[PDB]
Amino acid sequence: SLHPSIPCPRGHGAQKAALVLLSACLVTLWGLGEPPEHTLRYLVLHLASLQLGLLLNGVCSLAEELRHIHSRYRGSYWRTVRACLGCPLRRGALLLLSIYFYYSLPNAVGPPFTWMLALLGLSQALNILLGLKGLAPAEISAVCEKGNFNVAHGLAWSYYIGYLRLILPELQARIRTYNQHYNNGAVSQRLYILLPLDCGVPDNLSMADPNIRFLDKLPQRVYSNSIYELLENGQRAGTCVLEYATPLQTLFAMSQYSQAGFSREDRLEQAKLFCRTLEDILADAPESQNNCRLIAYQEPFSLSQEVLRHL
Amino acid sequence: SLHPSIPCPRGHGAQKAALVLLSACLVTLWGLGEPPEHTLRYLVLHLASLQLGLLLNGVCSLAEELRHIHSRYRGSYWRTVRACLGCPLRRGALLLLSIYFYYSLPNAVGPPFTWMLALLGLSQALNILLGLKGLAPAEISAVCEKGNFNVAHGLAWSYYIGYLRLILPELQARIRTYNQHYNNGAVSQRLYILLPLDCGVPDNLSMADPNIRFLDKLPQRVYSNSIYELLENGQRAGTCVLEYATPLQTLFAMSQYSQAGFSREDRLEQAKLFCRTLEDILADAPESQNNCRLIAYQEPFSLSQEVLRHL
Amino acid sequence: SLHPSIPCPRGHGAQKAALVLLSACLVTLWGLGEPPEHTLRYLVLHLASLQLGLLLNGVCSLAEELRHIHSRYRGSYWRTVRACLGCPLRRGALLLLSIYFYYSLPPFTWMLALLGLSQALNILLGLKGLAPAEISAVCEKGNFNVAHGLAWSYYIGYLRLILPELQARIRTYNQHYNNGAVSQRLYILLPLDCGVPDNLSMADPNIRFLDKLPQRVYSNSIYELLENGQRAGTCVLEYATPLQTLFAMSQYSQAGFSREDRLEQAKLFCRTLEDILADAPESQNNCRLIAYQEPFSLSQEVLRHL
Amino acid sequence: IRFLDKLPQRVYSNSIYELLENGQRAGTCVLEYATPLQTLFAMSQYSQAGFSREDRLEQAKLF
Ligand SMILES: CCn1nc(C)cc1C(=O)Nc1nc2cc(C(N)=O)cc(OC)c2n1C/C=C/Cn1c(NC(=O)c2cc(C)nn2CC)nc2cc(C(N)=O)cc(OCCCN3CCOCC3)c21
Ligand SMILES: CC1(C)C(=O)N(Cc2c(F)cccc2Cl)c2cc(C(=O)NCc3c(F)cc(F)cc3F)ccc21
Ligand SMILES: CC1(C)C(=O)N(Cc2c(F)cccc2Cl)c2cc(C(=O)NCc3c(F)cc(F)cc3F)ccc21
To answer: Binding of 2',3'-cUAMP: at which residues (chain D)?
Structure first.
């Protein structure tokens, strides 16, 4: 909620839509007057073949994993099987049930037992080769976000453990010490971090806008925290410790290089993510509680307009 | 592995037994050769009955849970509903499938929908009033240990955060300083925490065994650690910084009191759980890098033998 | 009674719901009007199926627990059987009664095999999941909650050791000081969110540290209770350190202890501290608890408690 | 005379003083005591200086 464009955490609208659809199907089934028993022999058997599809896709997925076992799966075969087939004991019954359900269930439409394995494997291999059963980008982001496999989440936490977690416990003492020597505006006790969404980070801050000008270097294992003041038509409307977010600077440099495999669109994906991750780490943080605030924006307006409203 | 009587975390032998039972049931069902359509329909209707009974039980629970909305569930109806009925959308789908597969599919063994609902309500009411369907202590212990629902977990983590994490770093420096000055054997550089599983903590450590004798208290927020010299057949084989585990004494005192409702069997279970939790925490702790060594013993033997063998 | 948001001990509204459902069931059975022998037979067979399912689940649990026998059951198979199957005699009698009714009332073993397969499926997948409300109810009834242990250890280790001499030390300081006077009660602060700063000034500038109470050694602090810039009260403020421990527990990932878990355990810690200190011999109006949560003026609440 | 601000800056620190007349500012400047005038004073305190009060005032006039 820091910015109109920062993504929201994934809601349950998707499953809520499945409940919408599931009502329609049950109404349709009783609406068509189809024999209820024949309905059950198809939902289970069709899902039985679908669950048998993962076994064949698992073996194809497994054959490559057997060469990483000394390095990736700490030399254990159980981890190798667990990574490709999920929980073994959970999937062990579903395979036996799929075998038993198919081995005996009468089927108005459906191959016999030996004909089942013939057709099922061919589709599994064809999908692998053609990539037809690929991952949609919308669900690639959803799985990565839920699994926290994002370069942004790594940068945000490193930015916290390395830098913010170390200075903030002693920034209040350092700011209180600084204010005890100077008397005017007022130096805010909250650290300020600029978050240009498009990863546009100049090397210095005084080049960003003339309204923000350098004042002094806050006294300090050496942390050069540059305090700045704001200009509101020739008057200091506020002074605060405003700095850039180094990870957002490196994120821009990440996309430029040709060996990073980091697309221009991907940079915007992990630039908005870094702000939200840094929003919620500080919210629960003990040191960064009522001690820091973030300035997130996107230049299409002046920067100094946003800084003042946060003071 | 501190003592043979400290339990290991619950494994997945229950799932293995479930797999064995499923295989045996499948083999028996195939051997007897009953019509598979009957098998499938009966199994589906049984699952439907179980799900609907769970729904009615959850409704009975939610009836009292309506008065807890403002306090225990932060005043939102949907959180209360999820707490009573589990996953809202998943349970909705399962119950809709149960409703369809009962109101449409036939059932030789099973009432009509209204009379089935009456019977199910009666059974749920009886199971709630008489508590006939209840959790055996094994499931309760398993759920508590998986979800960390134990007083021992709290005592162990409090012991780590409050006391151990604030002395283990400086204890090595204190021991080195005390060894540099007093050249009168040698002092071990690790604190040897005692964990009496019987929860018998006397005021004097020398009264546990005459061989353990109070030699000195190590010089120093005010932590007083007493080092004890160890007599092997009347000869001092050495010395080490030794002390009891206060949370075990507090556990015994809790057991004595009449408001804890914390019996001797429960006291022993939580004592062993606390010892295991402390072992795990100290093993994974970054501060305790070979800085402390737990000595868990149960009186069935001289403590001097065990402490020396660890020295 | 401690605070509006503190969860009350679980009441018997569930039994009210059970009575309502029982009345509705009796009314509808009377209305439909079917031979009651068939209803009784179906009910008894349903109970027998439930008992057989419990037997299968207990057998699986026992197959799990057989390897814990030398640490959880003193090497006695009887304790393992009782743990996995409830009360031994009662459960055995129930099982034989259910099996006898199963054999008596009008496939015989095929039904049992199907029931066993269904039980195995429920064990593996987990459709017979434990609702979080019922988990909390069982934990509170049996007192397996972390907050229970934390509060009881806080009582045995810290509160019970200093309350009997706190009033004497306060009186000594009262002779040492003169006109205001410090109250003879300990005011333990219990922030529900468990966010405790190191010093009260950071939490609230309206509260000023005054002095340390005279003195294992125990150090306590007396705080100025400023109001409108004037001194309005003096009482001993001391954060409940177990709440700080709970926050640190929720911080680390090895605790398996979520944020809502921390909040609920904070509420239970406050409520069971109320229960301990309500009837304790060492609590004779020399200790008063403060519980609040910022949606704030702590000093206003403390003065209201004075 | 009240301390108002420190002039921005080897390393030196100077103060600007709010010259108040009738409770209102009449002017501003940078005031700075002569630090030797302390050293001449702290000689007179010490018995090793051989530098008495009559000499302290007499010399501080020359300085
Ligand atoms: C069992 C009590 N309890 N249950 C819960 C839940 C919370 C507390 C609790 O907090 N009690 C507490 N709070 C105090 C505050 C002050 C003060 N003036 O501030 C002084 C006190 O008395 C000295 C305080 N006490 C009592 C003694 C406390 C700490 N302590 C412990 N703790 C445990 O064993 C234990 C058991 C469980 C379970 N969890 N823990 C860890 C918390 N072992 C010790 C052994 C030695 C020794 N052999 O030398 C010296 C100790 O004290 C020096 C530390 C002083 N520090 C402590 C905190 O920070 C500020 C001051 C020891
Ligand atoms: C949901 C519904 C009605 C449906 O739409 N189909 C698609 C479909 C066919 F597959 C086959 C014919 C018609 C339709 Cl119409 C389906 C299939 C089954 C089934 O049992 N398939 C066995 C099976 C295969 F047919 C091919 C294979 F490679 C493996 C395999 F294991 C059950 C229910 C359905
Ligand atoms: C696995 C098998 C054969 C089995 O063992 N039972 C237990 C049982 C009874 F519950 C009821 C009668 C006989 C048996 Cl024998 C069962 C039940 C159904 C079923 O559809 N039950 C609906 C249903 C009821 F019948 C009564 C009720 F109060 C609620 C309710 F929701 C299907 C298959 C089985």
So the answer is: 10, 35
Q: Which-ligand-closest: CA of C48? A: 3
Q: What are phi and psi of B239, to 5 degrees?
A: -155, 160
**Residue B106: how many other CB atoms lie within 10 Å:** 10
Q: Is B226 in the pocket of ligand 1 (CB under 6 A)?
A: no
Nearest ligand, CA of residue C51? 3
Chain A hits for B41, Cβ within 8 Å: 37, 40
B18 neighbourhood in chain C, CB within 8 Å? 60, 120, 123-124
Say if residue B193 is exposed, middle or buried (CB neighbours under 10 Å; 0-12, 13-18, 19+): buried
In this complex, do C121 and A93 lie within 8 Å of one another by their Cβ atoms? yes
> Ligand 1: does its nearest atom lie under 6 Å from the Cβ of B162?
yes
DSSP H or E stretch at residue B194: strand B187-196
- String of DSSP letters for B212-261: EEEEEEE------EEEEEEEETTEEEEEEEEE--HHHHHHHHHHHSSSS-
Closest CA relative to residue A185, chosen from A252, A238, A148, A250: A238
Q: Name chain C's partners: 3 or more CB pairs within 8 A.
A: A, B
Q: Under a CB-based contact definition with an 8 Å cutoff, are residues C222 and C235 in contact? A: yes
Residue C139 in 3-state DSSP? helix
Provide residues with CB under 6 Å of ligand 2. A 42, 45-46, 49, 107, 109-111, 116, 119-120, 123
Q: Please, what sign has the CA dihedral across residues A216, A217, A219, A225?
A: positive
- Closest Cα partner for A282 from A274, A272, A293? A293
DSSP state at residue C290 = E
Task: Answer for the pair C258, A284: CB distance below 8 angstroms, yes or no.
Answer: no
- Counting ligands in written order, the one closest to the CA of A42 is 2
Sign of CA dihedral C254, C257, C258, C263: negative
The pair of structure tokens assigned to A103 is 């081995």
Name the interface residues of A facing D (CB cutoff 8 Å). 181-184, 216
Distances in Å between the Cα of C238 and the Cα atoms of A286, B221, C78, C231, C235 are 19, 16, 49, 19, 10
| CA C305 remoteness from chain centre | 26
- State phi, psi for A242 to the nearest 5 degrees: -105, 120
Question: Whole-angstrom Cα distance, residue B208 to residue C214?
Answer: 35
The tokens 């669109």 sit on which residue?
Answer: A265
Residue A49 near residue A120, CB atoms below 8 Å: yes
d(CA C92, CA C141): 25
Q: Which of C121, C124, C259 sits opposite A89 (nearest CB)?
A: C124
**Of residues D22, D30, D38, D24, the one with CA closest to residue D3:** D30
Closest residue on chain A to D4 (Cα): A183
Choose among D4, D6, D8: nearest Cβ to A181.
D6
Give C-chain residues touching B155 at CB under 8 angstroms: 149-150, 153
Please report which helix (H) or strand (E) contains residue D29, including its range.
strand D24-31
Task: Report d(CA A239, CA A227) in Å as an integer.
Answer: 7
How far are the Cα atoms of B15, B93, C22 from residue A29, in angstroms, in the given order?
Answer: 36, 16, 34
B42 chain-C contacts, CB cut-off 8 A: 111, 114
Query: Do the chains contact at A184 and D6, CB–CB below 8 Å?
Result: no
Q: Residue B264, class by beta-carbon neighbours within 10 Å (0-12 exposed, 13-18 middle, 19+ buried)?
A: exposed
CB C100 within 8 A of CB C52: no
| Cβ atoms C71, B272 nearer than 8 A | yes
Torsion sign (Cα): A207, A211, A216, A221? negative
Find residue D6's DSSP bridge partners: D15
Residue of chain C whose Cα is closest to the Cα of B124: C18
